[PDB]
Design an enzyme around this catalytic site. Structure first.
Site, short mmCIF file in Angstrom:
data_model
loop_
_atom_site.label_atom_id
_atom_site.label_comp_id
_atom_site.label_asym_id
_atom_site.label_seq_id
_atom_site.Cartn_x
_atom_site.Cartn_y
_atom_site.Cartn_z
CG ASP A 184 2.48 63.66 55.96
OD1 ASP A 184 2.54 63.87 57.17
OD2 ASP A 184 1.40 63.61 55.35
CG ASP A 237 -0.84 60.19 55.44
OD1 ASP A 237 -1.76 59.77 54.70
OD2 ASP A 237 -0.78 61.39 55.78
CG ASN A 246 2.39 62.10 52.42
OD1 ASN A 246 2.53 63.29 52.22
ND2 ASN A 246 1.41 61.61 53.17
CE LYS A 294 -1.81 61.69 51.53
NZ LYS A 294 -3.06 62.51 51.57
CB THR A 352 -5.86 59.82 51.92
OG1 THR A 352 -5.29 61.03 52.42
CG2 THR A 352 -6.53 60.08 50.60
N1 LIG Z 1 10.84 67.94 53.53
C1 LIG Z 1 10.03 68.50 52.60
N2 LIG Z 1 10.53 69.05 51.46
C2 LIG Z 1 9.76 69.59 50.50
N3 LIG Z 1 8.42 69.69 50.62
C3 LIG Z 1 7.79 69.14 51.69
C4 LIG Z 1 8.57 68.53 52.78
N4 LIG Z 1 7.72 68.15 53.75
C5 LIG Z 1 6.49 68.47 53.29
N5 LIG Z 1 6.53 69.10 52.07
C6 LIG Z 1 5.37 69.61 51.30
O1 LIG Z 1 4.35 70.10 52.20
C7 LIG Z 1 3.17 69.33 52.15
C8 LIG Z 1 2.63 69.22 53.56
O2 LIG Z 1 3.55 68.65 54.51
P1 LIG Z 1 3.08 67.34 55.32
O3 LIG Z 1 4.27 66.83 56.09
O4 LIG Z 1 2.65 66.44 54.22
O5 LIG Z 1 1.93 68.03 56.25
P2 LIG Z 1 0.63 67.59 57.16
O6 LIG Z 1 -0.33 68.72 56.98
O7 LIG Z 1 1.06 67.47 58.62
N6 LIG Z 1 -0.01 66.05 56.74
P3 LIG Z 1 -1.15 66.00 55.44
O8 LIG Z 1 -2.40 66.67 56.00
O9 LIG Z 1 -1.25 64.51 55.12
O10 LIG Z 1 -0.53 66.86 54.35
C9 LIG Z 1 3.58 68.03 51.47
O11 LIG Z 1 2.52 67.39 50.74
C10 LIG Z 1 4.68 68.50 50.52
O12 LIG Z 1 4.08 69.09 49.33
MG LIG Z 2 0.92 65.30 54.18
#
Ligand SMILES: Nc1ncnc2c1ncn2[C@@H]1O[C@H](COP(=O)(O)OP(=O)(O)NP(=O)(O)O)[C@@H](O)[C@H]1O
Ligand SMILES: [Mg+2]
Length: 280
Positions: free
Chosen positions: A160, A138, A143, A140, A179
């Site tokens: 992510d 994933d 991420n 991008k 994506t």
């Molecule tokens: N460790 C972190 N610190 C700061 N922000 C984060 C962190 N992890 C995630 N985020 C924010 O939260 C969003 C969502 O978390 P993510 O791990 O990307 O979730 P997901 O729903 O499981 N996968 P996706 O559907 O691809 O977004 C990310 O795009 C970042 O904006």
């Molecule tokens: Mg994500």
């Protein structure tokens, strides 16, 4: 595996929302006992065996198991895990400088130096993961996140791990799909997937870093996916006329349909430019 079933709010105070996806809301938090700050990712659990809302326990356990293995400056780490009947709550390392995606949004196109300073970090994060036989699946601009956005050369972390998989046999066939703009042709064609797929995504990211434009993007998801499978991209003169020919060469060697012919993470680091659910 089971996780700590104490009330998360008994150990942390949550603050501002950092982000959201399908599957999760991520909140800034502060551990009471240490005063340290984390990103708490609340992943919604599947309510029934066959449901399509929420994430299956197998998938949550895979994300947690990969995260527990990690420890590298360019990747996020896992601090603790809690769960309750609705959510699993991953307490992740906080990355507070925003997405590379938003950085790129305000102001849109980088110098080759600024591009390679980000890319070199992404490449050593991905070299670590691939060394561990972990495919991220994933990659991008959303991420990738910056530790501090206000410094001339920010330091990045890959986030992510929601699609990441250990690749024990050189390929897996579990049928992952991210994506459309960023997925490699093998994902598009439902073929066995390996570490190579991340290298394609890196080429797409590199093209965008250098130009502010997405190489395969069409007007709909299905058209993007067609462009990807056909390797329908080109270096528009309007965007690339003053970009070095080695930068283009780097990209041209990643955006290769046959994964066996695409540059490996090791090759990308030795390259002369560098070397010192899915539908509309
Ligand atoms: N460790 C972190 N610190 C700061 N922000 C984060 C962190 N992890 C995630 N985020 C924010 O939260 C969003 C969502 O978390 P993510 O791990 O990307 O979730 P997901 O729903 O499981 N996968 P996706 O559907 O691809 O977004 C990310 O795009 C970042 O904006
Ligand atoms: Mg994500």
């Amino acid at each position: 595996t089971v996780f700590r079933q104490e009330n998360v709010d008994d150990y942390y105070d949550t603050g501002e929302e950092l982000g959201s996806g399908q599957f999760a809301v991520v909140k800034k938090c502060r551990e009471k006992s240490t005063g340290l700050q984390y990103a708490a990712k609340f992943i919604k659990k599947r309510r029934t065996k066959s449901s399509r809302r929420g994430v299956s326990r197998e998938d949550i356990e895979r994300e947690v198991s990969i995260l527990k293995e990690i420890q590298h400056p360019n990747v996020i780490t896992l601090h603790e895990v809690y769960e309750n009947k609705t959510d699993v709550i991953l307490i992740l390392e906080l990355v507070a400088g925003g997405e590379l995606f938003d950085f790129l949004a305000e102001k849109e196109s980088l110098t080759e130096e600024e591009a390679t300073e980000f890319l070199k970090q992404i490449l050593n994060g991905v070299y670590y993961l691939h060394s561990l036989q972990i495919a991220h699946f994933d990659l991008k601009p959303e991420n990738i996140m910056l530790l501090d956005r206000n410094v001339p050369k920010p330091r990045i972390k890959i986030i992510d791990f929601g699609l990441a998989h250990k690749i024990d046999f050189g390929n897996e066939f579990k049928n992952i799909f991210g994506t459309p703009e960023f997925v490699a042709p093998e994902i598009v064609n439902y073929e066995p997937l390996g570490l190579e797929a991340d290298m394609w995504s890196i080429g797409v990211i590199t093209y965008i870093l250098l130009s502010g434009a997405s190489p395969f993007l069409g007007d709909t998801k299905q058209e993007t996916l067609a462009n990807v499978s056909a390797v329908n991209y080109e270096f528009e003169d309007e965007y690339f006329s003053n970009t070095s020919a080695l930068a283009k060469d780097f990209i041209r060697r990643l955006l290769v349909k046959d994964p066996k012919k695409r540059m490996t993470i090791q090759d990308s680091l030795q390259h002369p430019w560098i070397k010192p659910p899915q539908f509309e």
